[PDB]
Amino acid sequence: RADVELERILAPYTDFHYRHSPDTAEGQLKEDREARFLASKMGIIATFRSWAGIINLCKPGNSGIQSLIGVLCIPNMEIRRGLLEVLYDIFRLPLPVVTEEFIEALLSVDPGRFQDSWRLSDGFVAAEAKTILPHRARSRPDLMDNYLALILSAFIRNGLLEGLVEVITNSDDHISVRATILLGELLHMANTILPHSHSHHLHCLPTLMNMAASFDIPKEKRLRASAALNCLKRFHEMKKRGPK
Amino acid sequence: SKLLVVGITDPDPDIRYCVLASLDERFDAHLAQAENLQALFVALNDQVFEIRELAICTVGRLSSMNPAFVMPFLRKMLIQILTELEHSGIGRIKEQSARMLGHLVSNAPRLIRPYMEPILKALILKLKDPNPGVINNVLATIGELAQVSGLEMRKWVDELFIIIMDMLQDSSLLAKRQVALWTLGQLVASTGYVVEPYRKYPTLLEVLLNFLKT
């Protein structure tokens, strides 16, 4: 069928009160919800690796990707904190730590952070040099960049950046830090793997800069937009520093 | 690189001004690298105001050759300029910030075309306040902004007409009329306000003809 069979797997996220089985034990109601969230997350990040899932989920109609972005712009702090893990695991980005300050979660997404493979017993210098020193190929195609550029263009076309700005402003701090780091990673990937016409107007951010410069709105939204832009500049400086 | 190091670290501002002025459009393909933009970003936050003007003109010109470097610093600088406009109530700082905003909007047309609304709101609310430098400054900025963004200023041309005719005609002071006349002619060639102000303001043709004999 058209829009009712494959789109069932993103039903734990789109439906806020989702009941999968009609007769279940009422004692387990939270663990069942986390199990539904985990299985639906695995199914969503498993359909975006196949071309028949990418094309069928991003159809130009009322597709199943626009219902995934539209429920992200709704202030429900349980679905909104769970969709960010799906967005982090789709683009193969590392997850930050669960905190409220940007300067603590910015340090956990450092590419030169210590890992357990870099110890002397396992992988002393060679496994560290694989991570921090770059590859010798400067003209190889690297098909992963092709796939990530296609996925990023398909997500930007359905309005992901406006939804990320809305999650950054009108939410808690625990989710604002994670959405700010996600927006920084997407804006860094845009000026790296996207063509110039796709990515010469993304770095302006009109919906966030017009909120950070409007003195008619309440001052909390303006100040958190200015703080978000300062954190985006700090993330850009961290990205242009490099691994040490 | 030696010229940029000298223009950054020299004590007296005359050599710094000569260095920051001599790097014209012939060096546009070579100043858009990494370390040259990192030196110009140091040149942006200078003590004296003229080198700040010159560095923000160079960076607003350079911002389309390598936008990934220049976009966050220009967003932060635009927010700082509007915060200097509204929040700080000193006329000198507001004049300098209006001049800096006009340099940024004259050297970078494509980036500030989506930021027309709060900038024009701030400049109009600065023109409606209860030295003539700030007035001809903001007239030059609003003329360049009218030239950059066409047909999206039709919701603003009425208030601008009512303000600029009260500053043109019935001049209680000896203010600059040439920049007001240029600004009035600059927002009718972009918006398309052709025949309507002749009847909406029945004294416009008379005061436009009086300037030829006085």
């Binding site: 190929a137 400067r138 003209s139 195609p141 000026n191 790296t192 793997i193 996207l194 063509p195 110039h196 016409s197 796709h198 010469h200 242009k240 | 393909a29 858009a32 690298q33 990494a34 389309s64 050759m65 390598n66 936008p67 990934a68 470097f69």
Partner: peptide, 29 residues
């Protein structure tokens, strides 16, 4: 992977990346 290839693809409304992997921040030509 070449300039002629991107110029051929531009006529059929398909854009491409015009920079290499040498520099992180390449100046737009």
């Amino acid at each position: 992977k070449t300039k002629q290839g991107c110029d051929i693809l531009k006529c059929h409304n398909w854009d491409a990346v015009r920079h290499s992997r040498k520099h992180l921040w390449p100046v737009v030509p």
